[PDB]
Amino acid sequence: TRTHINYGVKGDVAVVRINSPNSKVNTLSKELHSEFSEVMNEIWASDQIRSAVLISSKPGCFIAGADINMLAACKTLQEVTQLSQEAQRIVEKLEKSTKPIVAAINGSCLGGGLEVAISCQYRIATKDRKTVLGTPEVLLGALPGAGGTQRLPKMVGVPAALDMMLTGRSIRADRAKKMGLVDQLVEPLGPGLKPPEERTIEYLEEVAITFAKGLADKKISPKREKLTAYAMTIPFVRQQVYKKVEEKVRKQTKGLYPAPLKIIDVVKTGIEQGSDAGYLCESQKFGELVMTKESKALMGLYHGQVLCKKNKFGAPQKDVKHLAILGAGLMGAGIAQVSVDKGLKTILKDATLTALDRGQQQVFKGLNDKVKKKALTSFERDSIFSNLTGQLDYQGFEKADMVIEAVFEDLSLKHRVLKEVEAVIPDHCIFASNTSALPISEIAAVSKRPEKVIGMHYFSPVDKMQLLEIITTEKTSKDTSASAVAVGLKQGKVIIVVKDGPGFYTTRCLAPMMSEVIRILQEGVDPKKLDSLTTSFGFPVGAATLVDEVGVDVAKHVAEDLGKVFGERFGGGNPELLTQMVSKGFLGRKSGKGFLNSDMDSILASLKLPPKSEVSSDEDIQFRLVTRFVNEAVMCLQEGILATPAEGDIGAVFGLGFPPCLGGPFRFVDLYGAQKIVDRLKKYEAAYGKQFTPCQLLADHANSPNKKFYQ
Amino acid sequence: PNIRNVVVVDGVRTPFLLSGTSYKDLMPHDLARAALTGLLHRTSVPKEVVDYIIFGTVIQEVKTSNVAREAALGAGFSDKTPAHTVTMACISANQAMTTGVGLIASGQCDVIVAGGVELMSDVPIRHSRKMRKLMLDLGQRLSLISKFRFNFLAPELPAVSEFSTSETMGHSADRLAAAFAVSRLEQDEYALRSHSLAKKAQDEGLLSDVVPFKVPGKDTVTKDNGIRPSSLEQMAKLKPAFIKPYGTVTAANSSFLTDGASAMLIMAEEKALAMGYKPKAYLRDFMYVSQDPKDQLLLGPTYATPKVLEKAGLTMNDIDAFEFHEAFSGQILANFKAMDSDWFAENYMGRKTKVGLPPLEKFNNWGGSLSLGHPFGATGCRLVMAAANRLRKEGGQYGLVAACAAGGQGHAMIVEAYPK
Amino acid sequence: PNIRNVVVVDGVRTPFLLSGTSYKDLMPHDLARAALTGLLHRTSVPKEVVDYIIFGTVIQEVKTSNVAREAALGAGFSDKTPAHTVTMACISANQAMTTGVGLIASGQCDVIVAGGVELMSDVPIRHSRKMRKLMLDLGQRLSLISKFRFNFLAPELPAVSEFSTSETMGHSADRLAAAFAVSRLEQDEYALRSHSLAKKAQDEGLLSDVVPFKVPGKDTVTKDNGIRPSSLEQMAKLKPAFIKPYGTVTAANSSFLTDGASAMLIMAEEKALAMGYKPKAYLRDFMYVSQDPKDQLLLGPTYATPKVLEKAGLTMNDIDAFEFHEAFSGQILANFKAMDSDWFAENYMGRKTKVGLPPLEKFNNWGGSLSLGHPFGATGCRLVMAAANRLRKEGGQYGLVAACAAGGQGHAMIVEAYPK
């Protein structure tokens, strides 16, 4: 009947409204089209109404894309192509009606909503930051919900949206006029006789109805300088555009994404061939690349992506408004660069003036590029900058309520630093620290308050990567943890909570990968080759760039830290030579040039350590580093690193550097199987017998009795 | 009750001309001098008794800063009279009177001149941010400063956009207009009124706060120009300019670029009765408040008025004669519509109901803004005599003047009748 | 004696840089924001209690008028705080404090911020009087406006000349200098003092009215730059620039183009004792007088001081600590020389003798102008804390601050010690 969609008569115009009170946001589903069908036919069975308009009367987004648990609802190939052939037949119903129609946008329209949007004759949008217009198609790796890519370049153009529909990234409503998808804009309103946002969703109805009567008697026309140069001009440059794109997609990424080129063949065949006949090619394509081993776990990645952008600890009690960043440098000014714009007062501690110049010139230089790309106004830029004051000694920590240490890592100096920066701080505070190596329970037994100390570890370029990690002692209260993760998600960076251990999670898994980055050049296979060799498997940055990523000075400490405990037998397993690297005094990224450098070779030919021989090709050493990485990534939760490990590699792929289009280190028991990797290291069984030894929990349900982790 | 009182005396206003007529020749401190000499023409005051003149601009013609100093020296004042300008966006004058009454009630001086003077005919189009670095030029260093050059000559424009939100007056105008349910027909009944009364006001010819002077370049005299009446059907055809044609603010029912000046005199009451000039009004309390320029940009007056009624200790409906300042049609009826209901005093302060009820009859009868133009920083120092001679003309004894400014500041002050 | 009192609280001043160093990148409402945030760094006041901030410029960067509004909105103030600028020539700030104390003693508001902000690095070089008529341009009328043209492109310059007499600061400077029998040797003893004390003042490092901030374009921090000591023989070789070499004002002992800002806070005493901040000073009477700009152009302070001593009811020699503002060397000793004799109070008022006798010992010891530069509209709101912390540092309880302005206005007001 009318369970989610309804209209009425006002101005003799059908105001069909979109709402779904069950979830917070509305999703395109079979359960929505099952009633969205038998309304427009009644609109098409009417004659008094001469124009109609649809809108999402629920505040927030417009609609979702494909509903996350419905395309991931497992069904066989003929039905998943039947639904994705039926799903646009209802669009080819309404896109060419005799009675014209108008849609509207006042939200983050994403996914199949453009299918609803640009099929219309005339859409209308609201200029604000909340409304964005993007196509999450390649980001989950598919083709869209009804195949709108066969009328996007009819509308805006092949080269115009060809860098849109597979770049993944969204556009705000401001550039959409200069692009040409939506044509008219209307800015929202402030105060009303009704609350100051409910009128703005009820304002568009009347702007739509004053467009609507004009469409029926044609006072305005829907026929609304670089694309005009293209607009008729492709008789012969045909191959000489998508060939440039054919090698573009494999120079940006590497060739082991079989997803995005499989939307190119659409727009390759949509031009020059049968356009209406082209609407059934993707029916033979959408069922392929959804039922494949490329993006099958990518849906689970998205479930975890939305699943950890949640508070998850009760309710936030006594929210923070001030910060206290102990120490300038690269993390402190770094996390200040992100924790300043969206309403957090910060104070940035330094030792002398001589490093605040290196301080604020991050939080300014990485800020005005933001206004150089016109993503902010020129004025609000500077209020955002002036929310950040930099003290010198101490005057103002009596007002602070949350403290984050940022000093370069040591067990001895910070042990004192927590003892002198305890007295001028109130008792309802939070102390926290971004240690990377040494644990907090070794330093949580010193201060006056035992329970108001957590840990927050960041990652090194703080702007581009997008996650935090929490360090939780025995003594962390629920209010302390909730108040921490409030800063975590108000920060915007997707959180994961970790019960600690000697070496917590990320360096805990990175050093048993980094300790064999020396092992390829331990024989001397020209590790410039290794960059291509490992980016071929899928890692976005090479292992040479990983050791040029971590900083050469902390590499000896993250070698000695768990090597103090158990890193000599299976948190490592090769002779350390990085102290010989720094014996000359190489400086890493601050030396600018990386590794030919003419001095790595003298290390190995110092004394003849590589007479070694084993059949280890490139694929062999790729799976050696990956299988040890997943041996450690399955070692976690065997001691109970957290509650349930399906929360795991939402962290461990998203800042660690693990490739997407590979499901995660906790996700190779499923599409690659524990049986096959145990055959891989059982092929590797007689090599050393010491370091690569597999864990016991995954191995007992590995091969025969078809068991999985949770599936 | 022991604070010294304070008095408005006769308020000279040179008439307002739409830009492009005879004030396109002038110099932005000259009709200051004209209005001030006209003040010294009908006041008969010795020119050495006038104590502390203060003006107010918005443009600040930078060949001569602090306009009031030489603009008093030009009219032959005794130069033992200090002066300063006061620059706000729109209620510059009518910030002049309030700092003057603060200067008087401190009890140190004698009399104040307050005036507001501007010309939007010659807006300042300045040269660039970086070509003016060739000020370093003013024999090889003269070359080497000139050595670095590409084509970056572009005069940057003083786009009147309030800079806190980077958008012009009209976007916020029709936002607040459409937000409080204003139709196009209801928005122009007031536009019809604000000329239909104005032509009758000039017809009877008792709006007599006008001196003439001669423009030195062009021919004869001046008298106000922005008055034209029309019908409602001859207004809705005008396609709106501030936004795409779905919106509801056009150039017919909207302010226009006009130029002019104004002045008055403000006296202590005891010397007003000692010398013997017949006054016009007292000048009682004044609230002075601002609004956050993201939401309530031009919700100027009607967030300020119930803060001044309780300040004086009286009630709304028992006022005798308003006059609210306008800058757009509809804005003033949105400043009728919003506070003739609940929900808006609610949630933007605590627990009042309907504290704005202007009964529309005792409103802007001698046509306010949109009638004879809106100078950008000189209204207000029209408006006080347009309250004073008005409420003398009928009965009544009190009346509030309130105005809105580009930037969120409001202004509101009550004016009492003649002390006899 | 029943008038409410009034209080200066801690007076932030961003340091003054000679033009050409790191403030040649800025934007003339930005170090306003820097000085104001620095005021909100050491005051711990809730940002919603600060009532009515007022600033003062002289240049009025016209892309954003009324500097104080958005310059308070930029520092994250609650925007229920109205603001305005006040523009004079030279004592713009220190006209800010006096209209603030008038605003307080009227008894309607709570606290005042007064500050003065300018940059003479980017002076406004505007385009022409008649090329800006091409504003009429903004399809054949677009041609016909462009049809009339010869070569009349010339940027007219803001030559700082006071316009009432069409001659620069320096002509009137060395006129008044030579008119009161000032030799070149006597004119530069004071120039030696006004650096010799200044370097020692920065050496002991208790001139602590300075916040640093970082200039966003250039490298690190700021601290004052105009301080350089030299010998007397290394000064007389500098050939004078304001007049032909018979004259006696050169660029060594003269003000220089410098940029900077300043702010403070002004509190009512009863809320200063209710909230509990430790004050600095009271702020008693203020005379405010002007001089005719043909003869006594820079005879600013010493025509105003015996009008404020009799206003307060005390005597000259029993003041405890002056500080007179300077703009030229010699000017201040001509403001020593003239009133240490007769004939000048004679014939320019009636019957006093020697009402200026400053004993030179209790003078500008923490070096005033010429020490750390003279910003064109921000001095004064240095000078009050440089009186306050100074007379707290030694004994004594009273002290006058007095300044001269480009145009004949003077300023003089007495400042009392801390109320404990």
CA distance A60 to chain B (A): 19
Query: Which residues of B are catalytically annotated?
Result: 90, 404
Contacts of B316 (CB under 8 A, 6+ apart): B305, B306, B309, B355, B356, B357, B358
Provide the token pair at B141.
């260093």
Beta-carbon neighbour count of residue B185 at 10 Å? 9
- Maximum Cα–Cα distance for chain B, whole Å? 78
Helical residues (DSSP H) of A180-260, grouped into ranges: 198-216, 227-230, 239-252
CA distances from B407 to A150, B119, C78 (A): 48, 20, 14
- Of B262, B260, B266, B261, the closest CA to residue B52 belongs to B266
φ/ψ of A215, rounded to 5, equals -75, -30
Provide the token pair at A517.
């980055």
- Please tell me the experimental approach by which this structure was elucidated: cryo-EM
The answer to whether the beta carbons of residues C82 and C108 sit under 8 Å apart is no
The answer to whether the beta carbons of residues A408 and A551 sit under 8 Å apart is no
For Cα atoms A9, A14, A16, give the angle at the middle one, nearest 5 degrees. 115
> Chain A residues with CB inside 8 Å of B171's CB?
187
Number of residue pairs across B and C with CB atoms under 8 Å? 166
C403-417 burial, b for 16+ CB within 10 Å, e for fewer? bbbbbbbbbbbbbbb
Length of chain C: 420
**C-alpha torsion C198→C203→C206→C212, nearest 10:** 90
CB-based burial label for A193 (10 Å; 0-12, 13-18, 19+): middle
CA distance B7 to B420: 13
Q: Letter for the amino acid at A507? A: T
- Of A490, A418, A496, A407, the closest CA to residue A456 belongs to A496
For Cα atoms C197, C198, C199, give the angle at the middle one, nearest 5 degrees. 95
The rounded Cα B406 to chain-centroid distance in angstroms is 11
The answer to whether the beta carbons of residues A259 and A291 sit under 8 Å apart is no
Provide the token pair at C293.
């700009």
**8-state DSSP, A319:** -
Report the chain A residue with the minimal C-alpha distance to residue B339.
Answer: A193
φ/ψ of C401, rounded to 5, equals -115, 135
CA distance A49 to A15: 10
Q: State the best of A122, A129, A185, A186 to mutate against chain B, taking most chain B CBs within 10 Å.
A: A186
> Chain C residues with CB inside 8 Å of A354's CB?
220
CA distance A402 to A453: 10
φ/ψ of B283, rounded to 5, equals -145, 90
Catalytically annotated residue among A95, A137, A409, A469:
A469
CA distance A342 to chain C (A): 13
CA distance A615 to A562: 30
The answer to whether the beta carbons of residues C299 and C291 sit under 8 Å apart is yes
Kindly calculate the radius of gyration of chain C based on its CA atoms and give it in whole angstroms.
Answer: 22
Q: To one decimal place, what's the resolution in Å? A: 7.7
CA distance C293 to C410: 12
CA distance B28 to B57: 9
Catalytic-residue membership of C381: no
Chain A interface, Cβ < 8 Å to C: 353-354, 356-357, 360, 364, 379, 382-383, 385-387, 389, 395-396, 399
Beta B410-416 vs B286-287: how paired, if at all? antiparallel
- Of A515, A24, A83, A532, the closest CA to residue A287 belongs to A83
Beta-carbon neighbour count of residue A1 at 10 Å? 7
Beta-carbon neighbour count of residue C146 at 10 Å? 11
Contacts of C234 (CB under 8 A, 6+ apart): none
DSSP three-state, residue A101 = strand
Which positions 58-97 of C are in contact with B (Cβ < 8 Å)?
58-60, 62-66, 69-70, 73, 79-89, 95
**C-alpha torsion C372→C376→C382→C386, nearest 10:** 60
Neighbours of chain B (3+ CB pairs under 8 A): A, C
Which positions 22-81 of B are in contact with A (Cβ < 8 Å)?
none
> Chain B residues with CB inside 8 Å of C81's CB?
290
DSSP three-state, residue A29 = coil
Beta-carbon neighbour count of residue A702 at 10 Å? 18
CA atoms within 13 Å, Cβ hemisphere of A654: 20
Element of type H or E holding B268: strand B265-268
CB-based burial label for A45 (10 Å; 0-12, 13-18, 19+): exposed
CB-based burial label for A271 (10 Å; 0-12, 13-18, 19+): middle
Beta-carbon neighbour count of residue A165 at 10 Å? 23
CA distance C256 to A420: 47
CA distances from A20 to A28, A29, A66, A654, B146 (A): 10, 11, 15, 32, 67
Q: Letter for the amino acid at A317? A: Q
Provide the token pair at A617.
């090709």
CA distances from A659 to A80, A289, A535, A650, B236 (A): 27, 18, 9, 12, 62
CA distance B191 to B174: 15
CA distance A45 to A47: 7
B294 touches A at CB < 8 Å: yes
C132 touches B at CB < 8 Å: yes
For Cα atoms B409, B415, B420, give the angle at the middle one, nearest 5 degrees. 170
Beta A9-10 vs A431-433: how paired, if at all? unpaired
CA dihedral over A561, A562, A563, A565, signed as positive or negative: positive
Q: Letter for the amino acid at C162? A: E
**C-alpha torsion A265→A266→A267→A271, nearest 10:** 100
φ/ψ of C409, rounded to 5, equals -70, 140
Of residues A184, A377, A379, nearest to B244 (C-beta) = A184
- Of A27, A16, A35, the closest CA to residue A62 belongs to A27
- Of B6, B30, B4, B10, the closest CA to residue B392 belongs to B10
CA dihedral over A652, A657, A663, A667, signed as positive or negative: negative
Provide the token pair at C159.
């030559």
| Bridge partners (DSSP) listed for residue C116 | C262
- Maximum Cα–Cα distance for chain A, whole Å? 94
Of residues A353, A382, A387, nearest to C221 (C-beta) = A353
CA distance B14 to chain C (A): 23
CA distance B217 to C245: 44
Number of residue pairs across A and C with CB atoms under 8 Å? 35
φ/ψ of A5, rounded to 5, equals -125, 140
Element of type H or E holding C110: none
CA atoms within 13 Å, Cβ hemisphere of A303: 16
The answer to whether the beta carbons of residues C57 and C64 sit under 8 Å apart is no
Contacts of A371 (CB under 8 A, 6+ apart): A377, A378, A381
Q: Does residue C181 come out as left (phi exceeding 0), alpha (psi in the -120 to 50 range) or beta? A: left
Contacts of A34 (CB under 8 A, 6+ apart): none
DSSP three-state, residue A675 = helix
DSSP three-state, residue C116 = strand
